[PDB]
A paper describes a structure:
The heterotrimeric Replication protein A (RPA) is the ubiquitous eukaryotic single-stranded DNA (ssDNA) binding protein and participates in nearly all aspects of DNA metabolism, especially DNA damage response. The N-terminal OB domain of the [name] subunit ([name]) is a major protein-protein interaction element for RPA and binds to more than 20 partner proteins. The [name] domain adopts an OB fold with a five-stranded anti-parallel beta-barrel but has very weak ssDNA affinity. Its primary role is to mediate protein–protein interaction with its basic and hydrophobic groove and a side pocket, as first shown by a series of studies of [name] interacting with p53.
[name] has two tandem RPA-binding motifs with the same sequence localized between its nuclease and helicase domains. We fused one [name] motif to [name], and the fusion construct crystallized in space group P212121 with two molecules in the asymmetry unit. In the structure, [name] 435–451 form a continuous α helix and insert into the amphipathic groove of a symmetry-related RPA70Nb. Residues E439-R31b-D443-R43b-E442-R91b-E445 form a series of electrostatic interactions, and [name] M446 and L449 contact the hydrophobic patch formed by RPA70Nb L87b, V97b, I33b, M57b and I95b. The N-terminal part of each [name] peptide helix interacts with the [name] peptide that it fused to. WRNb Y436b fits into the side-pocket and forms two hydrogen bonds with RPA70Nb R31b. Compared to the [name]–p53 structure, the direction of the WRNa peptide in the groove is reversed and the positions of [name] Y436 and p53 M44 are different. The direction of the other WRNb peptide bound to the side pocket is the same as that of p53b. ITC titration of the [name] peptide with [name] yielded a KD value around 11.6 μM, whereas M466A mutation increased the KD value to around 37.4 μM. Mutation of the conserved arginine residues in [name] (R31, R41, R43, R91) greatly reduced the binding of [name] to the [name] peptide.
Numbering used by the authors:
A (entry chain B): 1 to 123, 435 to 451
B (entry chain A): 1 to 35, 38 to 123, 435 to 449
Write the structure that this text describes.
């Protein structure tokens, strides 16, 4: 149900920098990032039911949630503490510092609603994720 | 040092579908796709161009888990295949390769290669964003 998500949280985060709103978001996709020999970091495409936004990153202390598959595509999360940063190239990113998984992916089962990208950066993420899946699927 | 890579191999693969060459390429970035059996996408350089549509055959995954195939290492490809997909994207699947020099032996990205095509340019921009997001 879309109504159980924090409608408008993505727009408020991006345009006003709201950090106190404890948003309830669905994880749409997780992109592991493996730089050099370093342990992975996880970038997230998240949905508030209306929009998706791809500029989320998990703080390192939340990495075990992804490894344990507690935090996986289609689960629903309540974010407790997050910070907004503008990178040196102007891109606005959101670091998730503390959260709770409210519903596992299997309980939700699938993507909630039909959210659309909040910006071109997010549509570029969606394109690359679509590319990944296409390359992935060797057998038909 | 760029002359130590197979300059022009990416253009040969993409335009002519030449899989008889045994090109020497540098890994610029490796990324697992799923978050299941891992599957690795690679941004590779031939000294002139980068190309982001390389994927690793599952049987080469041990080289990645052993951290032998890693960003900045230089490899020689022994068997590969290139296909266009129904939607027109071209994908290169690396089937057999040897790591010639470790990431540490090479030490840095060789030269200043440019993206072969728009898809690679977007991939580099997105991967540079990924990295900027980490270093926070």
């Amino acid at each position: 149900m879309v109504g159980q998500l924090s409608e408008g949280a993505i727009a408020a985060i991006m345009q006003k920098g709201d950090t106190n709103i404890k948003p309830i978001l669905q994880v749409i996709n997780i992109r592991p990032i493996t730089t050099g020999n370093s342990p992975p970091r996880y970038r997230l495409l998240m949905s508030d039911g209306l929009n998706t936004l791809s500029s989320f990153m998990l703080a390192t202390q939340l990495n075990p949630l992804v490894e344990e598959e507690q935090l996986s595509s289609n689960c629903v999360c309540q974010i407790h503490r997050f910070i907004v940063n503008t990178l040196k190239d102007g891109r606005r990113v959101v670091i998730l510092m503390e959260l709770e998984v409210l519903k596992s992916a299997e309980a939700v089962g699938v993507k909630i609603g039909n959210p659309v990208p909040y910006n071109e950066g997010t549509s570029s993420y969606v394109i690359e994720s679509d590319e990944d899946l296409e390359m992935e699927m060797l057998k038909h």
